[PDB]
Scaffold this active site. Structure first.
Site, PDB file in Angstrom:
ATOM      1  N   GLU A 109      43.763  23.293  15.217  1.00 16.66           N
ATOM      2  CA  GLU A 109      44.530  24.022  16.946  1.00 16.66           C
ATOM      3  C   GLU A 109      42.989  22.838  18.078  1.00 16.66           C
ATOM      4  OE1 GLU A 109      45.023  27.563  18.111  1.00 16.66           O
ATOM      5  OE2 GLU A 109      45.247  27.253  20.451  1.00 16.66           O
ATOM      6  N   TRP A 145      50.200  35.722  31.599  1.00 17.63           N
ATOM      7  CA  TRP A 145      49.894  35.212  32.617  1.00 17.63           C
ATOM      8  C   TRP A 145      50.906  34.573  33.539  1.00 17.63           C
ATOM      9  CZ3 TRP A 145      49.771  34.666  26.919  1.00 17.63           C
ATOM     10  CH2 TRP A 145      51.170  34.071  27.171  1.00 17.63           C
ATOM     11  N   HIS A 170      43.872  22.482  21.406  1.00 21.13           N
ATOM     12  CA  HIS A 170      43.982  22.900  23.029  1.00 21.13           C
ATOM     13  C   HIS A 170      43.745  22.505  23.723  1.00 21.13           C
ATOM     14  CE1 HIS A 170      47.035  27.246  23.806  1.00 21.13           C
ATOM     15  NE2 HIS A 170      46.972  25.505  25.281  1.00 21.13           N
ATOM     16  N   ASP A 198      42.441  30.251  20.494  1.00 21.88           N
ATOM     17  CA  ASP A 198      42.091  31.711  21.143  1.00 21.88           C
ATOM     18  C   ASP A 198      40.935  32.620  20.628  1.00 21.88           C
ATOM     19  OD1 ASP A 198      42.281  33.074  23.668  1.00 21.88           O
ATOM     20  OD2 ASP A 198      44.379  33.794  23.597  1.00 21.88           O
ATOM     21  N   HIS A 243      45.083  32.007  13.322  1.00 23.88           N
ATOM     22  CA  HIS A 243      45.880  30.731  12.618  1.00 23.88           C
ATOM     23  C   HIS A 243      44.953  29.446  12.038  1.00 23.88           C
ATOM     24  CE1 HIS A 243      47.927  31.032  16.765  1.00 23.88           C
ATOM     25  NE2 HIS A 243      47.004  31.615  17.101  1.00 23.88           N
ATOM     26  N   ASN A 268      44.810  41.947  23.159  1.00 28.65           N
ATOM     27  CA  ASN A 268      46.313  41.274  23.023  1.00 28.65           C
ATOM     28  C   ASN A 268      46.696  42.190  21.758  1.00 28.65           C
ATOM     29  OD1 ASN A 268      45.986  38.150  22.684  1.00 28.65           O
ATOM     30  ND2 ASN A 268      44.938  39.364  24.470  1.00 28.65           N
ATOM     31  N   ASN A 304      33.981  31.932  30.511  1.00 27.12           N
ATOM     32  CA  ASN A 304      34.486  32.502  29.409  1.00 27.12           C
ATOM     33  C   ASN A 304      36.382  33.136  29.759  1.00 27.12           C
ATOM     34  OD1 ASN A 304      34.595  35.570  30.486  1.00 27.12           O
ATOM     35  ND2 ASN A 304      32.366  34.765  31.041  1.00 27.12           N
ATOM     36  N   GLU A 341      55.967  33.612  17.843  1.00 27.03           N
ATOM     37  CA  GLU A 341      54.763  34.532  18.880  1.00 27.03           C
ATOM     38  C   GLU A 341      55.131  34.574  19.965  1.00 27.03           C
ATOM     39  OE1 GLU A 341      50.190  32.372  20.629  1.00 27.03           O
ATOM     40  OE2 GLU A 341      51.067  31.863  18.948  1.00 27.03           O
ATOM     41  N   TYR A 342      55.446  36.583  20.132  1.00 28.35           N
ATOM     42  CA  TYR A 342      56.163  36.876  21.599  1.00 28.35           C
ATOM     43  C   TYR A 342      55.686  38.226  22.264  1.00 28.35           C
ATOM     44  CZ  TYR A 342      59.018  39.996  18.376  1.00 28.35           C
ATOM     45  OH  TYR A 342      59.145  41.321  17.925  1.00 28.35           O
ATOM     46  N   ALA A 343      56.562  39.064  22.926  1.00 25.77           N
ATOM     47  CA  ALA A 343      55.596  40.312  23.119  1.00 25.77           C
ATOM     48  C   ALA A 343      53.964  40.546  22.958  1.00 25.77           C
ATOM     49  CB  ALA A 343      56.579  41.417  22.453  1.00 25.77           C
ATOM     50  N   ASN A 390      39.425  30.724  25.487  1.00 26.74           N
ATOM     51  CA  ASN A 390      40.840  30.931  25.158  1.00 26.74           C
ATOM     52  C   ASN A 390      41.068  28.927  24.819  1.00 26.74           C
ATOM     53  OD1 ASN A 390      43.406  30.494  24.910  1.00 26.74           O
ATOM     54  ND2 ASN A 390      43.953  31.569  27.164  1.00 26.74           N
ATOM     55  N   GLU A 450      49.435  25.115  18.346  1.00 31.99           N
ATOM     56  CA  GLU A 450      48.390  24.573  20.170  1.00 31.99           C
ATOM     57  C   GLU A 450      47.729  23.126  19.556  1.00 31.99           C
ATOM     58  OE1 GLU A 450      47.215  27.836  21.628  1.00 31.99           O
ATOM     59  OE2 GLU A 450      49.295  28.379  23.150  1.00 31.99           O
ATOM     60  N   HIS A 503      44.480  38.434  13.467  1.00 35.75           N
ATOM     61  CA  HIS A 503      43.276  37.286  13.840  1.00 35.75           C
ATOM     62  C   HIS A 503      42.803  37.942  12.487  1.00 35.75           C
ATOM     63  CE1 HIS A 503      43.182  33.907  15.875  1.00 35.75           C
ATOM     64  NE2 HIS A 503      43.912  34.543  17.109  1.00 35.75           N
ATOM     65  N   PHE A 545      40.973  38.442  27.800  1.00 34.41           N
ATOM     66  CA  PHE A 545      41.886  37.668  27.280  1.00 34.41           C
ATOM     67  C   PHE A 545      41.414  38.100  25.375  1.00 34.41           C
ATOM     68  CE2 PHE A 545      45.577  34.283  26.798  1.00 34.41           C
ATOM     69  CZ  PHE A 545      46.327  34.788  27.231  1.00 34.41           C
TER      70      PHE A 545
HETATM   71 MG   LIG Z   1      45.353  28.292  21.727  1.00 26.90          MG
HETATM   72 NA    NA Z   2      43.959  35.587  23.506  1.00 30.82          NA
END
Ligand SMILES: [Mg+2]
Ligand code: NA
Ligand SMILES: [Mg+2]
Ligand SMILES: [Mg+2]
Ligand SMILES: [Mg+2]
Ligand SMILES: [Mg+2]
Ligand SMILES: [Mg+2]
Ligand code: NA
Ligand code: NA
Ligand code: NA
Ligand code: NA
Ligand code: NA
Ligand code: NA
Ligand code: NA
Lengths: 1007, 1009
Positions: free
Chosen positions: B404, B985, B406, B189, B379, B592, B585, B525-527, B90, B449, B345, B589
Site C-alpha cells: 500500500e 469524507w 497511498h 490506514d 490490507h 470505522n 495524526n 469497500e463500501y458503507a 491515515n 491504494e 484489520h 479516522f
Molecule cells: Mg490508504
Molecule cells: Na480509517
C-alpha cells in the site's frame, strides 16, 4: 558479502537506466548529433592485473597501482590478451550447475585507470561513470572508496561519482569477476569470455536535469498525419520558471516545436507527476521510416528557463513508423512485412566480443547488399551504436534481453522460480528503458532458450503495458506460448513435422492452422548455416511467399565465431572449440555463419541473396513480368539488363528501365530473337542493376537475377567419321588402346583405367574409379554437443571401407572403335552395396565415351554420391566450365547459380571451410575443361588439390596440404547437403539418392 | 551496508516460502492435525531493550544479555509495552517521503532469547527458525554469529540455523527496525507499530524432505466428479527408492490414495523435474466446500521409502470447490455468489496488532451470526491461523498482498517504477506460495491504494499464470484497470456518480454497463461505518439483489481501531489518533467499525445483519412467501415464527417449519385472522429461528426477520367530555394554566413553556424550545485526513444554524369552552437573515393533555437542517424508557430497516450509544408513544433521551470525558435528517433523506401518567 553469489543482489548504488544521453550545452550540437564536451570517453590504456580468485586480490591495489600490472587497451576481453583461455561450450554451463554458487577459483580481472577531472566538472552538477559492458559482474572503487556493484554483462551500469572525485588526478579500480550468479542467465551458445568489453565514459549532467524521455509516434488511418508525443522527466529542483522545449527537424528544416512548464496531467487520487511533462507535436504528411526508406527526423529536448537560458539538451533520431499485429499479420506502416532476417552475435576474430564501428558498418552493408532487411540481437542487448546504425541505414531489429538458461534441467528451472524474477526483471526492464526510442527496434524478445516459466509471463505483460508500440516475442517452451505475440520457432521445417514431446516443432505451414491458432509465424532461427549448408533454403522462401501468415525468419547466423591463433612460425589460423585448452567444449559448433569471421562470404551467402530478392519474375513468350515485393518504395534506382546466350555464347542483350510501384508489376517485351547460328539451348538471364550509388551500395550493384531456358535446337548432325581407328593390344595384365598420340591402359586385374598418356606424358597419378562417398559435411556429422546421422549410417554400412570386386573386364573391337566393359561389386562383410557396370568406347576421333549404370542395394543407406574420381597428374592454372556457377553449388543449394561459361583460377574451386569437408561442387555442368582435358555430359564436379580422404581426416583448414596433382571428382549424382538443422538428418527426401538404379554418361577427350 | 535503505535487498539468507509445514513423523498425527513434536513455539518471555537508532546498539549485545534489558512477552508490538508511541496516520506517511531512505532516528527493538536445543535436532536434519511477523525489517544473529535479514512485516521469514546451533543453551538476537525501505509499501490506514508481533517457532525437517506441495481440485460439468491433483517437490538427495503417497480422507474414511516415485513429465527440451511428482486422485460425488456448508477433506502427503519407512508427512485441509468468472458473473461451484463481506484489520485494543485464536473465533462467530459470508484481509496477509478458521467455519476470503503506497504523489509513483518491481513481487509471490492451498481463499488481491502501475500488470499476470484457480482483483487506478478481473471500487454509490478526473467512481449500476464493460462488480469497500453511520445500507442491498452482475461488497470495516489508555485513577478509556502524543495524526479516522474494539456491537451491525439475510419474504393476503437465497443448502435448521400485534399487543402467533431448497420458495398461509377489539394498526412480524445449535450459533439463533402492516382501524370514538375546565391566569410576564394539581407556565417575553408542575414539583430544568441542529456526527464532519467546505457541519456553521437565536414574533392566550389555547410564533435569525420560522399552538384541555402543533418554515436558501424538533431538560431522572415505535436499538431515517415496530422497554442507559467520538446518538424513529417517569408523549415522531445535552456531546471529543447532566435531556423531533455514510469524507446523505421540503408540520400530545 559475496554479492556475486546472490541473485537477490544484481547491483549496488547503480543509477536508473535511460536512453542515450550526452548532456549537450548547445542545442545546435544536439540537433546534428555532434560530439558533446560533457560526454568523455575513458577508453584507451588502462592498468590490469589477473588473479585466480577475488580472495587473491591485495588490498593495496585499492589505493595504489600494482607494479606487476600490465598496460592494456580497454575495452577488451582479457582472454584476447592471453590472461586465461576463452571457453567454447554450447549448452552445458561452463561451471558446475549449483545455483547461485560459482567456483571458488574465479578469474578476477583488476582494472585501474589514473585520469584527470577538471574543477569545472565538480564545482557544479553531477559526474557519473558509465560502463557499457562488463562481463560478468564487478565492484567499483574511486580514489580508494567503494562506490558500487553491477551485473548483466550486456547493459550499461552507471554510478554517481560526484562525491568521490577531486580536481586533477583520480584513480578508479574495477574488480571484474568472470563468474557470478548472473552467469546462470548468460548461457548463450558462444565463446565465454570476460572483462570490460564495451566503452567506459564519464558524463556530466547539471543538477537540474533531463533524467528520462520517451518518444512515440501515432498515426491516422492512412498515415497522412501523425502526432509525435514526447514525455520528459527531470530530476533536481522543481521551479516554476523551468521549461521543456521539444523541437522536431527534418534535415535542416524545423518541422514543429512545442514548449511547456513541468507538471503532468492528473493520474490518480494523489494527483499527477509534477516532475514530468508531455509535449505533443502534429506532423502533416510525415516521411515514414522503413528498412526500404529509413527516413529520419531529429527530436531535440531542451531543459531551460523561461528567460531563455539553456540548462541542457538531449536528443534522438526519430523514425515515424507504426508496428502492429492485426488479423494475424505483422504490419509496418499498415503493410505486412516479409522478414529477410539474420541472427547476429557480436564477434570479432581478433577482439573477441568487443565491437567497433567499422565492423558494425561492414556487417550492415554486407547484410543490405545481400538482401537482408532485419536482424535479431541473438541473444542480448547490443552495443549502443548498433541501434543508431540500424536506424540510419535501415534494418528491422529484434532487441533481446540477456537471459539464456539453456543448460538448466528442465530448461525453465530458473525462469519458473520467483526467486529469479527480480534478476530477470532487470534484464528486460533495463533493456526497454535504454532502447525504446530507436525506430529500428520493432519487436522485443524476452531472451532465448530458457524454457517457459511464469517469470516470462510476468515480463511479457510488463512490456505490453509500458510499451504498446511493439510486439513481444519469445520462443521458449514450444514457440507458441502465452508469452509470445508471434509464433517464433527455431528450426521448424517447411513441410515435415518433428513431433517432440511437449515442445514439438510442427511444419510451419501446419503450425499456422492448428486449431484455434491465429498468430503470424516468423522463425527466430532457421537454415542453420554451419559449414557447407543452406540446402533447402529456397523451400522456406517459396512457402513465405505463398502463405500470408508465414512472414519470414532470421537465418542462424551471420558470422562464424572462429578466433585467430598463431602457429609456431607466427602465422595466423582459424580456431574453434577446444583449441585454447578449453574443456569440455563444443568444437566447431561455434561456426555457423553465412560469412567467415573476417567477413569473407561463404558460398551460401549468394543463395540467401537470391532467395531474398525484392523483385519476382515470370516469363511468357517474349514477355518478362517483373513484380515488386517492396511495400513502400518505387524502383527508382533500378534498370533491368537482359541477356540471351547459346550454350554460353552471347546472342543479344538489352536494358530496360524498371518503374514498378511497390507491389506493382511491369511488363517488358523482349525484341525479336532471330535465329541462333547453331544447335543448342538458348538461355535468358536478367539482372536488376542499381545505376546510382546509395548509402549502402555502390553504383552498378546487382540486387536480383533470374534465368530461364528459351528455345532448344537439338543437334541431329553427325560426326565426320574418324580419319583413323584405334588399336587394341591385349595382354594378360592389360588391355591397351592406341590412337595417334594417345594411349589408354586398363588394368585387367583391377578393371579400371589405370593410366593415360598424351605424347610421352602420363596423365594419371591414381586410377579412375567409382566413388560413392564424400568427406562428411558438418550436417552429415550432425552434432551440436545421433546414430541416425548420415555419417554414422554410412560408416556403419561400410560405405567408406568398401572394396571393389571385379566381376568382369572385357575388350571388343568395333568397326571404328575399341570397347571395354567392366563390372564391379562393392561389398562389406559379405554385403553387396553397389554394383557398377560400365562401357568405355574409344573411337577414331580420340574421344572416350564412358557409360555407367550403378545399382544400389535398397537396404543400404542412400549414398552421398554416385560418380568417379581420379588424381590427375597435372596442375593447371584455370578451370573452365559450362554449367551452374560461378560459386560452389549443390543440388539443394543451386538456385542462385547461373548456367553460363565460367572460368576461374583453380583455387576458387576450393571453399576453405574452417572445418574441412566435401566442398566446391558445381552442378548441371555440360562441359569441363582443365589443362589438356575436356569432359562432356550432364554431371556435377569438384576439382582441387585435396583428396576426399585428406579432407575427411583433417579437422582444420590450415593443416591441409596440397597433394601432387589435381583431384577430380565427377558425379553423375550427388546427395543434397541439408541444413534445416545441423544436429539431425536434414536432407529432404527429394535430394536423397534413393532411386536404386542410376545412369550417367561422360565423354573424355583432349583439348 | 544499510540494507534497510535499499529496496533491492529485501532479505538475506532467507529460505523459500511454502505452505504451512509441521514435519510430522507419524501419518496419523498429520491426518488429525495434532501437535507435532517437530514444530516448537518460542513464544513466551524474551529479553528486550529499546534504542533510538541502530547505531546505538552495543556490540556486546550480540554476545550477551544487556543488563538494562527487560523481560517482555513475545509476540508483541513494543508500543503496547510503552517503549514508544504508536502513531495513527491515515494517508500521509509517518516518515518524510524520501525513498528509499528512512529517518536516522529509527526506533530499534533488540530482542533476545536464551533457549535449549536438543541434540536430536542437531544430529541429523535441518533446524530452521520461523518468524511469522516482524515489523518492519530485522537482522538475526544466533550465538553471536550473523544469520540473515528480512523485510515484509506480514509474511513469515525463515532461516536455516542448523550450522549455528549447539546442544543445550543457545541465544538468538533480533534487531528490529521500525522503519525500512519496506515501510514505503506499508502505508495502510491503521496504527503504525513495530516489533515481533506474530509467532516465532523452530521447525525440524529431515534432510530429504517435502519442500513444497500444491493441491488442486478440478470438476466435471455438474460437480458429480472431481480430480484431486497434488504436485509434490522435494529437497535432499534423490534416490530411486524414494516415494510419495498422497491420501485423502473424509473423517475416518480413506477416500483415495496414490503413490509414486519422484520424476515429473517432460516439460521442455531439457526434460522435466526429477525432484517433483504429481499424484492424481479420483473422487466421486465429492462433498463440496462453501461458506454455506464448509465440507472439508484431509490430504496427507507422506514422503517415504519403497520398503514403507516414513520419512516425514505434511498435510492440509482440502475443500472441493471451483471459483470462476463466466459470462460476467463470479461463480462458486457453478452458482453466482452474493458477497456479504466485511474488511477486517488485525486489531486488539490491548495487544495492538498481535492476534490470538480467541479473538479470531470471536470475530468469525459474530460475523456468521450477523449474516456475513466473506472477509477481505485489508490490507495484507493475515496470521496463518485465520485461514484455517475460515476454511473450517466457512467464510469466503480475499487474500491481499502487503502493498500500500497511498502517501506517494501521484499514488503509483513506486508501483509504476521497475526498480520497485522486485520488492513488490516478493509481497505477492510469497503470499501465493503460502496460502494457495486454503479453500477459503477465493480471490487474490494485489494490495491496496497504490495507484495503477506496470508492476501491477506484471504481478497480475504472474498470478494468473501460476494459479488459474482464483480470480485476481485490484482497485487502484480507477477500479476497472487491466490488473483486475473484478470491477472492485471503494465507496462508489448506488445511483450517484462521483466523476473525479482520471479515477471517477461511477454509480455501480451505471458502471456495469459502460461501453465494452463486462465484468462482475463487488465493492472492495463500501458503507463506511465510522461512528453513527451505515445510513443508506439498504439501498446497496436492493441494488445487489436486482442486478445479477452486482455481486455484493465488503463493508468498511469490522472493528474500531481504538487503543486502551488508563486515566489518573487507572481506569481504562478508548483512545484514537493523537492520544499518544503522536503527530501528525488523523484523530478518530481509525474508528470505522461495525463493532467497538472490545467486540461489543455498534447499532449499525443489526442493520447489516438484516439487509444481509438469506431469506426474502413477500406477503399476499394471508400468504407469506419465503424465498431462499442460499445457493447450496436446504433450510434444514430453520423454523418460521409469526406474530400479529395490535399496537404492541399480541393478538396471535404461531410457527411453521421451513423447508425451502436453495433458491426455492415456500408458501405459508396464516390461519384465519380473528378481528380485533380496539382501534389501532395490526402489525405482522416474522422471524427465522434455528432450533439447533451449530458450530457458529446457539440454539434459537434468529437469522432473519420482516414486518408488515396489516389492517388498521382508525379511532373514530370521540374524547369523553372532560371533568373540569382549565383556568388561565394572565400576568404581565406570563400565561399560567391551572388544572387539578398541574400547572404550566408560558413566559410572554420568551414565548416558550418555561415550567410545568405536578403538585409543587417542577418538571423542567430548561424550557421547551425548538431545535434545528444536532451534535455533528462523524459523517457530518466529513474528514478523513483537510476540510470539505461542502461538509454538512461546515455549511450549518457558516449559515449560523448553531448560533441562531429565537426572536419572538407572537405570544397570545385564548380561552375556549373546555380549554385554553396559547399561540406563539418565533423566528430564528443570523446576520439579519431569517433561517426558520416556528408557529405553534398549545391546547390544554380538561383532561390535562397538552396538544402541541408545530408548523415550521425553513428558508429555501439556507442549508437543509439537521432536524426539526423540540427539546428540553426534564428535572427528573427515571430508570426506564418505554415506547411504541421502532426498536429496540438506535435507528435513523436512512438506517431504520432492521428496527421493528413494537412496544419496547429499556433502561435509560441503553438509550445512549457510546460512540468513542461523541455525537448525536440513540434516536428511535417512527414512535407513536413515549413514556418516561410520569410523562407520556404521543404523536408520530423520532426521539432521543439521555443525560447528555447536544451541547455537551458536540463539545466533547471522547466519550470518557462526558458527565451526566442534572435531569434528562429529551429531543423529540417531527423530522430528522439522514445520517449518510456512503463515505465519511464528503456529503453522503441521499437527497431523499435531506429536510428540504421548506414547510413542515408535526403534532404531539404531552400528558401525565
Ligand atoms: Mg490508504
Ligand atoms: Na480509517
Ligand atoms: Mg548477485
Ligand atoms: Mg565546444
Ligand atoms: Mg591531487
Ligand atoms: Mg543455447
Ligand atoms: Mg531493504
Ligand atoms: Na508470407
Ligand atoms: Na552454434
Ligand atoms: Na527505375
Ligand atoms: Na574433415
Ligand atoms: Na446481484
Ligand atoms: Na427446517
Ligand atoms: Na463530539
Amino acid at each position: 558479502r559475496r554479492d556475486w553469489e546472490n541473485p537477490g543482489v544484481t547491483q549496488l548504488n547503480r543509477l536508473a537506466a535511460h536512453p542515450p544521453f550526452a548532456s549537450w550545452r548547445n542545442s545546435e550540437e544536439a540537433r546534428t548529433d555532434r560530439p558533446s564536451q560533457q560526454l568523455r570517453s575513458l577508453n584507451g590504456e588502462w592498468r590490469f592485473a589477473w588473479f585466480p580468485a577475488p580472495e587473491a586480490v591485495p588490498e593495496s591495489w585499492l589505493e595504489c597501482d600494482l607494479p606487476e600490472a600490465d598496460t592494456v587497451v580497454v575495452p577488451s576481453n582479457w582472454q584476447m590478451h592471453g590472461y586465461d583461455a576463452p571457453i567454447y561450450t554450447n549448452v552445458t554451463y561452463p561451471i558446475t550447475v549449483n545455483p547461485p554458487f560459482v567456483p571458488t577459483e574465479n578469474p578476477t580481472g583488476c582494472y585501474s585507470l589514473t585520469f584527470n577531472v577538471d574543477e569545472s566538472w565538480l564545482q557544479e552538477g553531477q559526474t557519473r561513470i558509465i560502463f557499457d559492458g562488463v562481463n560478468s559482474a564487478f565492484h567499483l572503487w574511486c580514489n580508494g572508496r567503494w562506490v558500487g556493484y553491477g551485473q548483466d554483462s550486456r547493459l550499461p551500469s552507471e554510478f554517481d561519482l560526484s562525491a568521490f572525485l577531486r580536481a586533477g588526478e583520480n584513480r578508479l579500480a574495477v574488480m571484474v569477476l568472470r563468474w557470478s550468479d548472473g552467469s546462470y542467465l548468460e548461457d548463450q551458445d558462444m565463446w565465454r569470455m570476460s572483462g570490460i568489453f564495451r566503452d567506459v565514459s564519464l558524463l556530466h549532467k547539471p543538477t537540474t536535469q533531463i533524467s528520462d524521455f520517451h518518444v512515440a509516434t501515432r498515426f491516422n488511418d492512412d498515415f497522412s498525419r501523425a502526432v509525435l508525443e514526447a514525455e520528459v522527466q527531470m530530476c533536481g529542483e522543481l521551479r516554476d520558471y523551468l521549461r521543456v522545449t521539444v523541437s522536431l527537424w527534418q534535415g535542416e528544416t524545423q518541422v514543429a516545436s512545442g514548449t511547456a512548464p513541468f507538471g503532468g496531467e492528473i493520474i490518480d487520487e494523489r494527483g499527477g507527476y509534477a516532475d514530468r511533462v508531455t509535449l505533443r507535436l502534429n506532423v502533416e504528411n510525415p516521411k515514414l521510416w522503413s528498412a526500404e526508406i529509413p527516413n529520419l527526423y531529429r527530436a531535440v529536448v531542451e531543459l531551460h528557463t523561461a528567460d531563455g537560458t539553456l540548462i541542457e539538451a538531449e536528443a534522438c533520431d526519430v523514425g515515424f513508423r507504426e508496428v502492429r499485429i492485426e488479423n494475424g499479420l505483422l504490419l509496418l506502416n499498415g503493410k505486412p512485412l516479409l522478414i529477410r532476417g539474420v541472427n547476429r552475435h557480436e564477434h570479432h576474430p581478433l577482439h573477441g566480443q568487443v565491437m567497433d564501428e567499422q565492423t558494425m558498418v561492414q556487417d550492415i552493408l554486407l547484410m543490405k547488399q545481400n538482401n537482408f532487411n532485419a536482424v535479431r540481437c541473438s541473444h542480448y542487448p547490443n552495443h549502443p551504436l548498433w541501434y543508431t546504425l540500424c536506424d540510419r541505414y535501415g534494418l528491422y531489429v529484434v532487441d533481446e534481453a540477456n537471459i539464456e538458461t539453456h543448460g538448466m534441467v528442465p530448461m525453465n528451472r530458473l525462469t519458473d522460480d520467483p526467486r529469479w524474477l527480480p534478476a530477470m526483471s532487470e534484464r528486460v526492464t533495463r533493456m526497454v528503458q535504454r532502447d525504446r526510442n530507436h525506430p529500428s527496434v520493432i519487436i522485443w524478445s524476452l531472451g532465448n532458450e530458457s524454457g517457459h516459466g511464469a517469470n516470462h509471463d510476468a515480463l511479457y505483460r510488463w512490456i505490453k503495458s509500458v510499451d504498446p508500440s511493439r510486439p513481444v516475442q519469445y520462443e521458449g517452451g514450444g514457440a507458441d506460448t502465452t508469452a509470445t505475440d508471434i509464433i517464433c520457432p527455431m528450426y521448424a521445417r517447411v513441410d515435415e513435422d518433428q513431433p517432440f514431446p511437449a515442445v514439438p516443432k510442427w511444419s510451419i505451414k501446419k503450425w499456422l492452422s492448428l486449431p484455434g491458432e491465429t498468430r503470424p509465424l516468423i522463425l527466430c532461427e532457421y537454415a542453420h548455416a554451419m559449414g557447407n549448408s543452406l540446402g533447402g533454403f529456397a523451400k522456406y522462401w517459396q512457402a513465405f511467399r505463398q502463405y500470408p501468415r508465414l512472414q519470414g525468419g532470421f537465418v542462424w547466423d551471420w558470422v562464424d565465431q572462429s578466433l585467430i591463433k598463431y602457429d609456431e612460425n607466427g602465422n595466423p589460423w582459424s580456431a574453434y572449440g577446444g583449441d585454447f585448452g578449453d574443456t569440455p567444449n563444443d568444437r566447431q559448433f561455434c561456426m555457423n555463419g553465412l560469412v567467415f569471421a573476417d567477413r569473407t562470404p561463404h558460398p551460401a551467402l549468394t543463395e540467401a541473396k537470391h532467395q531474398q530478392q525484392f523483385f519476382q519474375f515470370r516469363l511468357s513468350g517474349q514477355t518478362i513480368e517483373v513484380t515488386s515485393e517492396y511495400l513502400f518504395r518505387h524502383s527508382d534506382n533500378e534498370l533491368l539488363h537482359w541477356m540471351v546466350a547459346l550454350d554460353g555464347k552471347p546472342l543479344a542483350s538489352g536494358e530496360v528501365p524498371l518503374d514498378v510501384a511497390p507491389q506493382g508489376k511491369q511488363l517488358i517485351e523482349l525484341p525479336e530473337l532471330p535465329q541462333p547460328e547453331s544447335a543448342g539451348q538458348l538461355w535468358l538471364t536478367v539482372r536488376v542493376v542499381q545505376p546510382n550509388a546509395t548509402a549502402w551500395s555502390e553504383a552498378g550493384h546487382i540486387s536480383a537475377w533470374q534465368q530461364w531456358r528459351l528455345a532448344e535446337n537439338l543437334s541431329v548432325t553427325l560426326p565426320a567419321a574418324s580419319h583413323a581407328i584405334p588399336h587394341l593390344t591385349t595382354s594378360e595384365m592389360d588391355f591397351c588402346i592406341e590412337l595417334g598420340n594417345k594411349r589408354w591402359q586398363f588394368n585387367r586385374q583391377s578393371g579400371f583405367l589405370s593410366q593415360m598418356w598424351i605424347g610421352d606424358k602420363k596423365q594419371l597419378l591414381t586410377p579412375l574409379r567409382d566413388q560413392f562417398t564424400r568427406a562428411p559435411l558438418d550436417n552429415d556429422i550432425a552434432v551440436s554437443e545421433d546414430p541416425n546421422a548420415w555419417v554414422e549410417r554410412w560408416k556403419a554400412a561400410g560405405h567408406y571401407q568398401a572394396e571393389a570386386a571385379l566381376l568382369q573386364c572385357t575388350a571388343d573391337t568395333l568397326a571404328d572403335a575399341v570397347l571395354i566393359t567392366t563390372a564391379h561389386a562393392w561389398q562389406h562383410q559379405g554385403k553387396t552395396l553397389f554394383i557398377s557396370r560400365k562401357t568405355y568406347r574409344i573411337d577414331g576421333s580420340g574421344q572416350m565415351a564412358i557409360t555407367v549404370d550403378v545399382e544400389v542395394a535398397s537396404d543400404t543407406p542412400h549414398p552421398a554420391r554416385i560418380g568417379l574420381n581420379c588424381q590427375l597428374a597435372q596442375v593447371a592454372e584455370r578451370v573452365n566450365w559450362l554449367g551452374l556457377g560461378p560459386q560452389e553449388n549443390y543440388p539443394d543449394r543451386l538456385t542462385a547459380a547461373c548456367f553460363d561459361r565460367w572460368d576461374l583460377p583453380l583455387s576458387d574451386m576450393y571453399t576453405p571451410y574452417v572445418f574441412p569437408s566435401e566442398n566446391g561442387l558445381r552442378c548441371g555442368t555440360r562441359e569441363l575443361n582443365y589443362g589438356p582435358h575436356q569432359w562432356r555430359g550432364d554431371f556435377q564436379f569438384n576439382i582441387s588439390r585435396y583428396s576426399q580422404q585428406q579432407l575427411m581426416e583433417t579437422s582444420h583448414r590450415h593443416l591441409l596440404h596440397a597433394e601432387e596433382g589435381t583431384w577430380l571428382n565427377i558425379d553423375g549424382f550427388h546427395m543434397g547437403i541439408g541444413g534445416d538443422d545441423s544436429w539431425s538428418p536434414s536432407v529432404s527426401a527429394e535430394f536423397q539418392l534413393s532411386a536404386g538404379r542410376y545412369h550417367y554418361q561422360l565423354v573424355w577427350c583432349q583439348k
